[PDB]
Design a protein around this nucleic acid. Structure first.
Ligand SMILES: *C[C@@](*)(O)[C@H](CCCNC(N)=[NH2+])NC(=O)[C@@H]1CCCN1C(=O)[C@H](N)Cc1ccccc1
Ligand SMILES: *[C@@H]1O[C@H](CO)[C@@H](O)[C@H](O)[C@H]1NC(C)=O
Ligand SMILES: [Cl-]
Ligand SMILES: [Cl-]
Ligand code: NA
Ligand code: NA
Ligand SMILES: [Zn+2]
Ligand SMILES: [Zn+2]
Ligand SMILES: [Zn+2]
Lengths: 27, 249
DNA sequence: GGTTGGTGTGGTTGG
């Protein structure tokens, strides 16, 4: 469904300034 | 939020502000999980030791906000509450077990660049993401230090192993809770604080790129204290109750 | 304008 995708970020293929820290924590 | 930073515009479009009409003040955080349902901590609505017991008409929900206090014309939507549903087994007398409540809005809110619901986890998402050491993100307009922000604050924090959570407090922890925060020796700091309860602890799934709400800011002992950790309602553990309420009402 | 109109000794609201 339409949940968890942000119009100003994921929808425009743009990252917010710290999500990368989250992704790195998985690795 | 202590030791966090200002959120970027549209970064947490599911963030909701629970607002008391009189006097006018921010009560708590909350989240949008559909165009008609808002999830929050039950103690934001019912807590007898603080003579707290809100009825739908004592409250308003403000969605799409960034500034803590200014009315953001044509950006935020203010909604009234049709019905409040508190978990039947919410244990306020002892440890805030199942600190979770759903609020059905009178009218559905239209999504926009600033307003969109967050996903609720299913079993695979919970199993895969809710692991000690993985980081989630907490947002809120609550206090900046133990005892405030002009705009929504954000902080990223690592989920902590359950034995460590248990040993950090004498309050009885349950499987309906998890804790997060840096260890006495990890260098970093950060935590949610009073005023942030109801707010979402979210994780971005590395498999489908969507944000999932894994937790709800629930309680702590002081804020950002060395050796202490913030506690959060475990959303997947109570999802059967969330789905039964939404399906039925 | 702005994360948004048309006008504020603002307003459901700062500058
Ligand atoms: C209601 C919320 O805004 C708030 C969130 C606190 C989060 N704190 C940290 N450090 N992450 N919750 C509370 O204030 C809850 C409501 C009941 C009292 N409480 C506490 O967190 C007390 N500090 C501890 C407590 C007392 C009684 C039962 C359980 C916990
Ligand atoms: C809370 O207040 C409502 C209306 O005032 C009432 O129906 C309900 O019994 C109260 N619940 C409490 C205090 O547990
Ligand atoms: Cl009362
Ligand atoms: Cl009274
Ligand atoms: Na801490
Ligand atoms: Na204006
Ligand atoms: Zn959409
Ligand atoms: Zn009273
Ligand atoms: Zn109805």
């Amino acid at each position: 469904a339409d949940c968890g995708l942000r119009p100003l970020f994921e929808k425009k293929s743009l990252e917010d300034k710290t999500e990368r820290e989250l992704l790195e924590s998985y690795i | 939020i202590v030791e966090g930073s200002d959120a970027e515009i549209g970064m947490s479009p599911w963030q909701v502000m629970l607002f008391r009409k009189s006097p006018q003040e921010l009560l708590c955080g909350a989240s949008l999980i559909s165009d008609r349902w808002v999830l929050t901590a039950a103690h934001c609505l019912l807590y007898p030791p603080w003579d707290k017991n809100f009825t739908e008409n004592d409250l308003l929900v403000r969605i799409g906000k960034h500034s803590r206090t200014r009315y953001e014309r044509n950006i935020e939507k203010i909604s009234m509450l049709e019905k409040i549903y508190i978990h039947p087994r919410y244990n306020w007398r002892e440890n805030l077990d199942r600190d979770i409540a759903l609020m059905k809005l009178k009218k559905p809110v239209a999504f926009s660049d600033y307003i969109h619901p967050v996903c609720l986890p299913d079993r695979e998402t919970a199993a895969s993401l809710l692991q000690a050491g993985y980081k989630g993100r907490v947002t809120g307009w609550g206090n900046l230090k133990e005892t405030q922000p002009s705009v929504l604050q954000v902080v990223n924090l690592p989920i902590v192993e359950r034995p460590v959570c248990k040993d950090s407090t004498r309050i009885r922890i349950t499987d309906n809770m998890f804790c997060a925060g840096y260890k006495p020796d990890e260098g970093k700091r950060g935590d949610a604080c009073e005023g942030d309860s109801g707010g979402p602890f979210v994780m971005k799934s590395p498999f489908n790129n969507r944000w999932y709400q894994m937790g709800i800011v629930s309680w702590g002992e002081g804020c950002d204290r060395d050796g202490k950790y913030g506690f959060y309602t475990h959303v997947f553990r109570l999802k059967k109750w969330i789905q039964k309420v939404i399906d039925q009402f």
